[PDB]
A paper describes a structure:
In addition, the electrostatic surface potential on one side of SegC reveals two positively-charged grooves, which might play a key role in the DNA-binding ability of SegC. All four monomers exhibit an almost identical conformation, with the root mean square deviation (r.m.s.d.) ranging from 0.20 to 0.25 Å (in Cα). Therefore, Interface-1 of dimer AB most likely plays a major role in the formation of the SegC dimer, and the interaction between the two dimers contributes to the assembly and stabilization of the entire tetramer. The major residues that contribute to Interface-I are Ile160 and Leu161 from the C-terminal α8 helix of SegC. Furthermore, interactions in the SegC AB' dimer interface (Interface-2) are primarily attributable to loop-rich regions, comprising the α4β2, β2β3 and β3β4 loops of both monomers. We also noticed that two SegC tetramers can assemble into an octamer from two adjacent asymmetric units.
Genome segregation is a fundamental process that preserves the genetic integrity of all organisms, but the mechanisms driving genome segregation in archaea remain enigmatic. This study delved into the unknown function of SegC (SSO0033), a novel protein thought to be involved in chromosome segregation in archaea. SegC has a tertiary structure folding similar to those of the ThDP-binding fold superfamily, but SegC shares only 5–15% sequence identity with those proteins. Surprisingly, we found that SSO0033 exhibits nucleotide triphosphatase (NTPase) activity and assembles into filaments in the presence of nucleoside triphosphates (NTPs) and DNA.
Author numbering:
A (entry chain A), B (entry chain B): 1 to 165
The structure:
Amino acid sequence: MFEKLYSAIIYSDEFKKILLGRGVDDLEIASAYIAFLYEDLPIIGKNLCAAFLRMGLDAVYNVMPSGKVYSPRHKLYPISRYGIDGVCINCDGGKIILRISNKGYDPEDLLESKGLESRIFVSKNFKKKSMEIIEKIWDVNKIRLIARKEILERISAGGILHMIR
Amino acid sequence: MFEKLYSAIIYSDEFKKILLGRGVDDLEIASAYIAFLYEDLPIIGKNLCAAFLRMGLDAVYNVMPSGKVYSPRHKLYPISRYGIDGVCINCDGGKIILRISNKGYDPEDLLESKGLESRIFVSKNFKKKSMEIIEKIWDVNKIRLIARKEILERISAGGILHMIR
């Protein structure tokens, strides 16, 4: 049920290590959870995991150098433009601001949330909490190695330089 | 005695497929043969395979968007500059010019060459003849899969973006 969500989190993590040499952030993973709940909500800002959930490996062609994804067809925007009433992941534009708080949602608590709010907070260490949930259920190391090979196959279709461009 | 040369050819083929979505050309492979025979000769032009022979995996940090390598320390130049008396792979500068001829050297014959004409020629399908030799010695697929893992590992250190710069 959460298969599509957890896969997007592992795959986006692997691609970011290839692209920027580090893995996805607490809030980048949070954006995947938001995209999972609200399929037509625009995600603005640190939105890389949400991009993999909505676009799959095709997200690779729309990543900015910042690691933010621009693909309007999937309602993903690196910065806030006029009229996009979306969630701003770690930023102050859009209709809803999403940031980190002591008493913000844990991954499980966020999936049960039944409504959107003008401001949204996720707990600290959201990434660490979310990975532990996935590690229980899957052999994450085997999944990462498959993801790496599949991402590398994608990049090598037309090459690093064409894919960036 | 030829393992480092054949390895450089397979690794550079795999890296070029990641960088530009295609394999190495007949004369890019020939440039490694030349680097192998003449360790101090500057190599100008289509020179990627020579770069891996001389720099190993460090060649990935010095590739131009043309797939030509710039590393003065390793006598590798993408274009001919004043006083660089080197072999020009597929170009007309330097002191020696290397191109394809219907009568040009085969890989075995080139390895047996004992001096340096003002105009060297390699035969057509030099890449095919070279790949056909290497494939009689190793399971090339095992090499490619290792080269991929190690190239990707190198790229992911600082990420694709920092590497091509």
